[PDB]
Amino acid sequence: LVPVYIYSPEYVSMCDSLAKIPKRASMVHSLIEAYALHKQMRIVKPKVASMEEMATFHTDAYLQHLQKVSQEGDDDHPDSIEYGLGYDCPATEGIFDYAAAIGGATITAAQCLIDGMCKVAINWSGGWHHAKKDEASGFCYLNDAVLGILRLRRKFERILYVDLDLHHGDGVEDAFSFTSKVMTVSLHKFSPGFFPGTGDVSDVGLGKGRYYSVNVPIQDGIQDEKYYQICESVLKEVYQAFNPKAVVLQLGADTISGDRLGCFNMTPVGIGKCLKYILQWQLATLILGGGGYNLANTARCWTYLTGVILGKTLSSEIPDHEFFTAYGPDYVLEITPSCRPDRNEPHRIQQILNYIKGNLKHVV
Ligand SMILES: Cn1cc(CNCC2CCN(c3ncc(C(=O)NO)cn3)CC2)c2ccccc21
Ligand SMILES: [K+]
Ligand SMILES: [K+]
Ligand SMILES: [Zn+2]
């Protein structure tokens, strides 16, 4: 019953080097350990993914290119245009090893779930949901969520992927767009000019996977109570129509008030309610992180959610620890949203929910 916590010092040290989130993995782990939450979990060292494990989704040519430019960080290689490596996804030195470690961490969590070691396994440094089988994308060099789902498919016949990141989980949706055995549900900002431009409510999958992809397009300024209302309404229909046997849950914290992107107006309490609704299904659940560019707020969010997973209530006072000064000026766990307009007109929200309920009729 005790949740598995994927962690090692080597793993955190590698994840700390990712370009857009310097030291975020150490902050997340350090805050969790300062609340002593790791003492209530089964700590599991992640294995590094092998080439053949990564190739269950990614092409050998992509992985070999990534490995080659990773050796010295060749960010000027003429073939990188083939593979999505460039301004947004630079060929950092060591990026292949970091990708292999994150992929391996998510696979390890999936393996713990299928071995019955736990009902909940956590890889807070995972959630690289934009990566494609032969292209890096949106800071994602390897799609560890896809690798996790594929591992879970060795044992579980139907997997539900739920993506609460601010951005559409397009890489995961694409990987499974043509199958009814994996259903993807993404709540995300959908607006002209907002990356990656996909995931309208009319995108429902393709072929035999038609109606087994679900997209909930949301506008700026949504807050906890309406977001949870939307999420519960969709997930309730999904659970009834699809009958999942296992769940992969991406919890990117770029929805949280105070993020540099400043789109949604969420607090960890609202995401926590979504998490609780999924946990009460009592299915094997693989928990991933993702985006989150206010480093201290992301650590606030995921520490709180770790608390939710353990059924614990955490003290408001941020405990003294290595990154204590990042939590100023108030040094508390809670995040106060700002007072700004919610651009989600309730009639449009009901149109979207009705559309989705109609789509899920076609599902058995
Ligand atoms: C496909 N496509 C490509 C572009 C080019 N610019 C996009 C950059 C990509 C890189 N980037 C980016 N990546 C990941 C995240 C994240 O948190 N993902 O969960 C956030 N930000 C900034 C925006 C683009 C812009 C708008 C709409 C679609 C478009
Ligand atoms: K999302
Ligand atoms: K699908
Ligand atoms: Zn994001």
Side-chain angles (χ1 to χ4, degrees), residues 15-27:
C15 296
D16 277 343
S17 310
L18 294 175
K20 285 297 203 294
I21 45 171
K23 296 285 180 66
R24 198 189 68 179
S26 282
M27 289 174 71

PDB file of all heavy atoms in Angstrom, residues 15-27:
ATOM      1  N   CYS A  15      18.911  15.324 -13.376  1.00  0.00           N
ATOM      2  CA  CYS A  15      17.738  16.110 -13.735  1.00  0.00           C
ATOM      3  C   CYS A  15      17.945  17.585 -13.427  1.00  0.00           C
ATOM      4  O   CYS A  15      17.386  18.437 -14.125  1.00  0.00           O
ATOM      5  CB  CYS A  15      16.501  15.555 -13.029  1.00  0.00           C
ATOM      6  SG  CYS A  15      16.058  13.858 -13.555  1.00  0.00           S
ATOM      7  N   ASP A  16      18.775  17.903 -12.421  1.00  0.00           N
ATOM      8  CA  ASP A  16      19.090  19.290 -12.071  1.00  0.00           C
ATOM      9  C   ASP A  16      19.734  20.071 -13.209  1.00  0.00           C
ATOM     10  O   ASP A  16      19.721  21.306 -13.173  1.00  0.00           O
ATOM     11  CB  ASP A  16      20.043  19.347 -10.874  1.00  0.00           C
ATOM     12  CG  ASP A  16      19.328  19.230  -9.553  1.00  0.00           C
ATOM     13  OD1 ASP A  16      18.094  19.424  -9.510  1.00  0.00           O
ATOM     14  OD2 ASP A  16      20.008  18.948  -8.547  1.00  0.00           O
ATOM     15  N   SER A  17      20.312  19.394 -14.191  1.00  0.00           N
ATOM     16  CA  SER A  17      21.008  20.038 -15.299  1.00  0.00           C
ATOM     17  C   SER A  17      20.113  20.358 -16.488  1.00  0.00           C
ATOM     18  O   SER A  17      20.615  20.894 -17.478  1.00  0.00           O
ATOM     19  CB  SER A  17      22.157  19.152 -15.787  1.00  0.00           C
ATOM     20  OG  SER A  17      22.970  18.738 -14.706  1.00  0.00           O
ATOM     21  N   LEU A  18      18.827  20.018 -16.448  1.00  0.00           N
ATOM     22  CA  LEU A  18      17.960  20.320 -17.580  1.00  0.00           C
ATOM     23  C   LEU A  18      17.804  21.827 -17.721  1.00  0.00           C
ATOM     24  O   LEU A  18      17.686  22.549 -16.728  1.00  0.00           O
ATOM     25  CB  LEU A  18      16.591  19.658 -17.416  1.00  0.00           C
ATOM     26  CG  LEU A  18      16.603  18.126 -17.452  1.00  0.00           C
ATOM     27  CD1 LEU A  18      15.219  17.549 -17.165  1.00  0.00           C
ATOM     28  CD2 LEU A  18      17.125  17.652 -18.792  1.00  0.00           C
ATOM     29  N   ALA A  19      17.769  22.289 -18.973  1.00  0.00           N
ATOM     30  CA  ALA A  19      18.072  23.685 -19.284  1.00  0.00           C
ATOM     31  C   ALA A  19      17.092  24.650 -18.623  1.00  0.00           C
ATOM     32  O   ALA A  19      17.503  25.627 -17.981  1.00  0.00           O
ATOM     33  CB  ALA A  19      18.079  23.887 -20.803  1.00  0.00           C
ATOM     34  N   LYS A  20      15.789  24.398 -18.776  1.00  0.00           N
ATOM     35  CA  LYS A  20      14.784  25.375 -18.380  1.00  0.00           C
ATOM     36  C   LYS A  20      14.414  25.289 -16.908  1.00  0.00           C
ATOM     37  O   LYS A  20      13.673  26.153 -16.421  1.00  0.00           O
ATOM     38  CB  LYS A  20      13.531  25.209 -19.249  1.00  0.00           C
ATOM     39  CG  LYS A  20      13.683  25.741 -20.682  1.00  0.00           C
ATOM     40  CD  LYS A  20      13.938  27.249 -20.669  1.00  0.00           C
ATOM     41  CE  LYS A  20      13.541  27.925 -21.982  1.00  0.00           C
ATOM     42  NZ  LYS A  20      14.372  27.504 -23.142  1.00  0.00           N
ATOM     43  N   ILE A  21      14.914  24.290 -16.186  1.00  0.00           N
ATOM     44  CA  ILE A  21      14.506  24.098 -14.796  1.00  0.00           C
ATOM     45  C   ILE A  21      15.725  23.814 -13.925  1.00  0.00           C
ATOM     46  O   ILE A  21      15.750  22.796 -13.211  1.00  0.00           O
ATOM     47  CB  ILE A  21      13.451  22.988 -14.689  1.00  0.00           C
ATOM     48  CG1 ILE A  21      13.846  21.759 -15.528  1.00  0.00           C
ATOM     49  CG2 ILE A  21      12.099  23.529 -15.145  1.00  0.00           C
ATOM     50  CD1 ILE A  21      12.939  20.527 -15.306  1.00  0.00           C
ATOM     51  N   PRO A  22      16.731  24.692 -13.923  1.00  0.00           N
ATOM     52  CA  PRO A  22      17.945  24.433 -13.140  1.00  0.00           C
ATOM     53  C   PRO A  22      17.632  24.159 -11.678  1.00  0.00           C
ATOM     54  O   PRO A  22      16.943  24.941 -11.015  1.00  0.00           O
ATOM     55  CB  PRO A  22      18.747  25.733 -13.301  1.00  0.00           C
ATOM     56  CG  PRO A  22      17.693  26.781 -13.622  1.00  0.00           C
ATOM     57  CD  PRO A  22      16.737  26.051 -14.501  1.00  0.00           C
ATOM     58  N   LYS A  23      18.136  23.026 -11.181  1.00  0.00           N
ATOM     59  CA  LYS A  23      18.060  22.625  -9.774  1.00  0.00           C
ATOM     60  C   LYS A  23      16.643  22.328  -9.305  1.00  0.00           C
ATOM     61  O   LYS A  23      16.422  22.160  -8.095  1.00  0.00           O
ATOM     62  CB  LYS A  23      18.676  23.686  -8.848  1.00  0.00           C
ATOM     63  CG  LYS A  23      20.156  23.900  -9.039  1.00  0.00           C
ATOM     64  CD  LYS A  23      20.921  22.741  -8.418  1.00  0.00           C
ATOM     65  CE  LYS A  23      22.420  22.906  -8.586  1.00  0.00           C
ATOM     66  NZ  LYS A  23      22.938  24.080  -7.827  1.00  0.00           N
ATOM     67  N   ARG A  24      15.668  22.268 -10.214  1.00  0.00           N
ATOM     68  CA  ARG A  24      14.293  22.028  -9.787  1.00  0.00           C
ATOM     69  C   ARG A  24      14.141  20.646  -9.149  1.00  0.00           C
ATOM     70  O   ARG A  24      13.394  20.479  -8.174  1.00  0.00           O
ATOM     71  CB  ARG A  24      13.325  22.201 -10.963  1.00  0.00           C
ATOM     72  CG  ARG A  24      11.875  22.393 -10.501  1.00  0.00           C
ATOM     73  CD  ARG A  24      10.882  22.355 -11.658  1.00  0.00           C
ATOM     74  NE  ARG A  24      10.801  21.016 -12.251  1.00  0.00           N
ATOM     75  CZ  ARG A  24       9.999  20.672 -13.266  1.00  0.00           C
ATOM     76  NH1 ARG A  24       9.174  21.562 -13.818  1.00  0.00           N
ATOM     77  NH2 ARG A  24      10.012  19.423 -13.725  1.00  0.00           N
ATOM     78  N   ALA A  25      14.851  19.645  -9.657  1.00  0.00           N
ATOM     79  CA  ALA A  25      14.677  18.310  -9.090  1.00  0.00           C
ATOM     80  C   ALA A  25      15.168  18.260  -7.642  1.00  0.00           C
ATOM     81  O   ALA A  25      14.529  17.643  -6.780  1.00  0.00           O
ATOM     82  CB  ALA A  25      15.396  17.272  -9.961  1.00  0.00           C
ATOM     83  N   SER A  26      16.286  18.929  -7.355  1.00  0.00           N
ATOM     84  CA  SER A  26      16.784  19.001  -5.986  1.00  0.00           C
ATOM     85  C   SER A  26      15.824  19.767  -5.089  1.00  0.00           C
ATOM     86  O   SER A  26      15.601  19.376  -3.938  1.00  0.00           O
ATOM     87  CB  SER A  26      18.167  19.653  -5.960  1.00  0.00           C
ATOM     88  OG  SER A  26      19.144  18.726  -6.371  1.00  0.00           O
ATOM     89  N   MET A  27      15.229  20.846  -5.599  1.00  0.00           N
ATOM     90  CA  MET A  27      14.278  21.605  -4.789  1.00  0.00           C
ATOM     91  C   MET A  27      13.071  20.754  -4.422  1.00  0.00           C
ATOM     92  O   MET A  27      12.638  20.733  -3.262  1.00  0.00           O
ATOM     93  CB  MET A  27      13.852  22.868  -5.533  1.00  0.00           C
ATOM     94  CG  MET A  27      14.968  23.924  -5.609  1.00  0.00           C
ATOM     95  SD  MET A  27      14.500  25.332  -6.655  1.00  0.00           S
ATOM     96  CE  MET A  27      13.279  26.096  -5.605  1.00  0.00           C
TER      97      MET A  27
END
